[PDB]
């Protein structure tokens, strides 16, 4: 029985729901006092892929409740109710970079500065979205991630990296005051000068 997997809003401007494998889905949003709820079917089963429905900006509203359900022949396999604002999960920051911040003399240790940019769809330039980021790193041959408190800017230093090894870095975003954290960015491999 196809059941819902996820609904996410990358920038609080549009959203999309996906499910597991004809299944169709219906929606209705509180257009004011009571629901108009003339249950309309998905307006886009393509833009977002297979087993998905795409709600662009015109079918999107914040702070207004939505109800959804994917019917089948003599069916209703999953009912879902949410509100766009509480369904945000921004894209991964990207364009990661690093450079020496302080050449550690003898070697052994080194400090660098990682940098990146906010994903392109989030309107942080005008206020629609405020984003916290989280970065993690580890030596390539160990599985446990070093976690760093969430900073509010697009750059930060990571100190004491042992020069005699290769490290990796990844970051991920989350709009403030919402539980989400989208996927992590592409991994950033860090190889230092060493020896002098």
């Amino acid at each position: 029985e196809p059941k819902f997997t996820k609904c996410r809003s990358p920038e609080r401007e549009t959203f999309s729901c996906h499910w597991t494998d004809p299944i169709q889905l219906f929606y209705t949003r509180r257009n004011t006092q009571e629901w108009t709820q003339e249950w309309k079917e998905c307006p886009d089963y393509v833009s977002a892929g297979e087993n998905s429905c795409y709600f662009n900006s015109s079918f999107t509203s914040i702070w207004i409740p939505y109800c959804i359900k994917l019917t089948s022949n003599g069916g209703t396999v999953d009912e879902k109710c949410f509100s766009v604002d509480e369904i945000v999960q921004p894209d991964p920051p990207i364009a990661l970079n690093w450079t020496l911040l302080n050449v550690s003399l003898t070697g052994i240790h080194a400090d660098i500065q990682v940098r990146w940019e906010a994903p392109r769809n989030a309107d942080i330039q005008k206020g629609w979205m405020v984003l916290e980021y989280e970065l993690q790193y580890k030596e390539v041959n160990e599985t446990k991630w070093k976690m760093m408190d969430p900073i509010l800017t697009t750059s930060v230093p990571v100190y004491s990296l042992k020069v005699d090894k290769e490290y990796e870095v990844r970051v991920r975003s989350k709009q403030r005051n919402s539980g989400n954290y989208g996927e992590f960015s592409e991994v950033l491999y860090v190889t230092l000068p060493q020896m002098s």
């Binding site: 409740p65 330039q125 005008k126 629609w128 539980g179």
Partner: protein, 185 residues
């Protein structure tokens, strides 16, 4: 004379609202996952006789675009009001807060936090009064008032959070376009 930088009044309003919100949000989260399963969530939401909140009579925008064509005064009038609406009601939530596990959850602590931010906005209205014709309907409207328990409470918690996000979001839309370089590069 020209005008004094507002980047301190904004940093001080924007911290306060961001706090109210972070308070509202977490207490909701907490309450919800103890006495309200998905079961009751959808029922509640499906019934505007529970999912609808008193603070939905003062007409706010509902998407970036519509909101990004709201004159500064306007945005600040709406936020002033949502803050005032929650002035009395918070009275209730009291126990919930002082029964929660959030360092800062308390009826008083919040009331004051609302009376504080309230004064902060009026002040910006006076200063950051950006052209915008102080003559309109939202400008002519006062705030909103409030009338089992488990539901009743989670209903308020639902709306406090809903609203504190509105307030905190409308301010920043003002901040960015009034204090340059504040949402920088």
């Amino acid at each position: 004379f020209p005008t004094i930088p507002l980047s301190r009044l904004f940093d001080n309003a924007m911290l306060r609202a961001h706090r109210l919100h972070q308070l509202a949000f977490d207490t909701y989260q907490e309450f919800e996952e103890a006495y309200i399963p998905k079961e009751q969530k959808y029922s509640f939401l499906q019934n505007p006789q529970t999912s609808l909140c008193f603070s939905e009579s003062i007409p706010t925008p509902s998407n970036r675009e519509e909101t990004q064509q709201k004159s500064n005064l306007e945005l600040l009038r709406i936020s002033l009001l949502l803050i005032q609406s929650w002035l009395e009601p918070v009275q209730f939530l009291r126990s919930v807060f002082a029964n929660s596990l959030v360092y800062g959850a308390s009826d008083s602590n919040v009331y004051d936090l609302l009376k504080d931010l309230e004064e902060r906005i009026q002040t910006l209205m006076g200063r950051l009064e950006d052209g915008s014709p102080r003559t309109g309907q939202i400008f002519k409207q006062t705030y909103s008032k409030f009338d089992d328990a488990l539901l009743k409470n989670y209903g308020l918690l639902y709306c406090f959070r809903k609203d504190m996000d509105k307030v905190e979001t409308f301010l920043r839309i003002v901040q960015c376009r009034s204090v340059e370089g504040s949402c920088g590069f």
